[PDB]
Design an enzyme around this catalytic site. Structure first.
Site, mmCIF file in Angstrom:
data_model
loop_
_atom_site.group_PDB
_atom_site.id
_atom_site.type_symbol
_atom_site.label_atom_id
_atom_site.label_comp_id
_atom_site.label_asym_id
_atom_site.label_seq_id
_atom_site.Cartn_x
_atom_site.Cartn_y
_atom_site.Cartn_z
ATOM 1 N N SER A 198 0.783 -1.241 0.000
ATOM 2 C CA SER A 198 0.000 0.000 0.000
ATOM 3 C C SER A 198 0.811 1.285 0.000
ATOM 4 O O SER A 198 0.244 2.367 -0.207
ATOM 5 C CB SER A 198 -0.980 0.051 1.190
ATOM 6 O OG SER A 198 -2.127 -0.759 0.966
ATOM 7 N N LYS A 244 2.410 6.658 5.107
ATOM 8 C CA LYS A 244 1.547 5.683 4.443
ATOM 9 C C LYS A 244 2.046 4.284 4.764
ATOM 10 O O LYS A 244 3.208 3.957 4.501
ATOM 11 C CB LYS A 244 1.533 5.886 2.927
ATOM 12 C CG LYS A 244 0.613 4.892 2.192
ATOM 13 C CD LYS A 244 -0.867 5.210 2.426
ATOM 14 C CE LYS A 244 -1.751 3.977 2.135
ATOM 15 N NZ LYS A 244 -1.775 3.025 3.299
ATOM 16 N N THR A 245 1.170 3.473 5.342
ATOM 17 C CA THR A 245 1.477 2.094 5.687
ATOM 18 C C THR A 245 1.256 1.150 4.494
ATOM 19 O O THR A 245 0.665 1.530 3.483
ATOM 20 C CB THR A 245 0.581 1.642 6.855
ATOM 21 O OG1 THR A 245 -0.748 2.136 6.635
ATOM 22 C CG2 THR A 245 1.105 2.192 8.182
ATOM 23 N N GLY A 246 1.744 -0.078 4.612
ATOM 24 C CA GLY A 246 1.413 -1.110 3.646
ATOM 25 C C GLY A 246 1.561 -2.488 4.261
ATOM 26 O O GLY A 246 2.390 -2.688 5.140
HETATM 27 N N1 LIG Z 1 -3.449 -6.336 1.130
HETATM 28 C C1 LIG Z 1 -3.527 -4.898 1.022
HETATM 29 O O1 LIG Z 1 -3.953 -4.397 -0.009
HETATM 30 C C2 LIG Z 1 -3.089 -4.083 2.169
HETATM 31 C C3 LIG Z 1 -3.900 -4.513 3.380
HETATM 32 C C4 LIG Z 1 -5.047 -3.647 3.784
HETATM 33 C C5 LIG Z 1 -5.020 -2.240 3.324
HETATM 34 N N2 LIG Z 1 -4.374 -1.359 4.311
HETATM 35 O O2 LIG Z 1 -3.269 -1.807 4.929
HETATM 36 S S1 LIG Z 1 -2.191 -0.847 5.359
HETATM 37 O O3 LIG Z 1 -1.060 -1.539 5.943
HETATM 38 O O4 LIG Z 1 -1.811 -0.080 4.161
HETATM 39 O O5 LIG Z 1 -2.701 0.092 6.332
HETATM 40 C C6 LIG Z 1 -4.462 -2.086 1.914
HETATM 41 N N3 LIG Z 1 -3.149 -2.678 1.879
HETATM 42 C C7 LIG Z 1 -1.967 -1.897 1.635
HETATM 43 O O6 LIG Z 1 -0.894 -2.463 1.673
#
Ligand SMILES: NC(=O)[C@@H]1CC[C@@H](NOS(=O)(=O)O)CN1C=O
Length: 260
Positions: free
Chosen positions: A41, A205-207
């Protein structure tokens, strides 16, 4: 507690990547800073910047309503799933994708601006020859060992954040907007925000992805000192590994201590 990046990596297992830049002096705190990691993300920060940059040529872009359907909804879309009936504006989708990490919002923005190639092109335009976005949500989170799709390096992402948030890659109005979005991250309290003193302000921004991939990138504003840019990437050996929020918080403490 582990006192160095190397020690933290050994304690946690897996592969840890850190680039922290003290913007006052240009000192760096590094671990595998030039290795590639699946960004998951965290690319949404770049996506937001790419949209803002397109809005410089077309100021009406942020205004545009994007309608999408039930079948456009992918997993982890907490904002967009509430607006199938009205659609959302480009600006609204940017806020949703950065602040709530909404996946459908990312896909819908990418459809509008030219897809994964458009985000990669934007990265090149700001001097990042490393970043590559190849796929859409949610496939881009597969995080397969050995796969270079949807990767960047901690150093490249930190450099991007420095020029985007603290530099002049964007005009002042768009720079201010990107900062507002990053400061408003709602889903990162257990990561970078957990590893700095509460007096420090964070835009990030996390991911998260497969192979227990756990990431967070951003800018830290201490109360009485120049900002620090921090990119943290982490991934693990087993496909079903669990994400480790605490690894990011620990890396943040070490980085902040090193640059104290
Ligand atoms: N599998 C995904 O798409 C993950 C998990 C859930 C969403 N947010 O996660 S975060 O670590 O970005 O806060 C979106 N995301 C971003 O990495």
């Amino acid at each position: 507690a582990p006192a160095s990046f190397a020690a933290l990596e050994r304690a946690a297992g897996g592969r840890l990547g850190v680039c922290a830049i003290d913007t006052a002096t240009g000192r760096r705190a590094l671990h595998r800073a030039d290795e590639r990691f699946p960004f998951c993300s965290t690319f949404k920060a770049m996506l937001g910047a790419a949209v803002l940059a397109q809005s410089v040529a077309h100021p009406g872009l942020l205004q545009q309503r994007v309608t999408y359907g039930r079948s456009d909804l992918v997993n982890y879309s907490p904002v967009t799933e509430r607006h199938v009936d009205t659609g959302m504006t480009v600006a609204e989708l940017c806020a949703a994708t950065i602040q709530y990490s909404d996946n459908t919002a990312a896909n819908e923005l990418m459809k509008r601006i030219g897809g994964p190639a458009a985000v990669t092109a934007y990265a090149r335009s700001i001097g990042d020859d490393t970043f590559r976005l190849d796929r859409w949500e949610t496939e881009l989170n597969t995080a397969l060992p050995g796969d270079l799709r949807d990767t960047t390096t901690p150093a490249a992402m930190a450099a991007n954040l420095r020029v985007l948030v603290l530099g002049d890659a964007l005009p002042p109005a768009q720079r201010a907007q990107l900062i507002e979005w990053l400061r408003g991250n709602k889903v990162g309290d257990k990561r970078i925000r957990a590893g700095v003193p509460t007096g420090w302000r964070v835009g990030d921004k996390t991911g998260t992805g497969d192979y227990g991939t756990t990431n967070d990138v951003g800018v830290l504003w201490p109360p009485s000192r120049a900002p620090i840019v921090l990119a943290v990437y982490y991934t693990q050996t087993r496909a079903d590994a669990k994400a480790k929020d605490d690894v990011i918080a620990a890396a943040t403490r070490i980085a902040s201590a090193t640059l104290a």
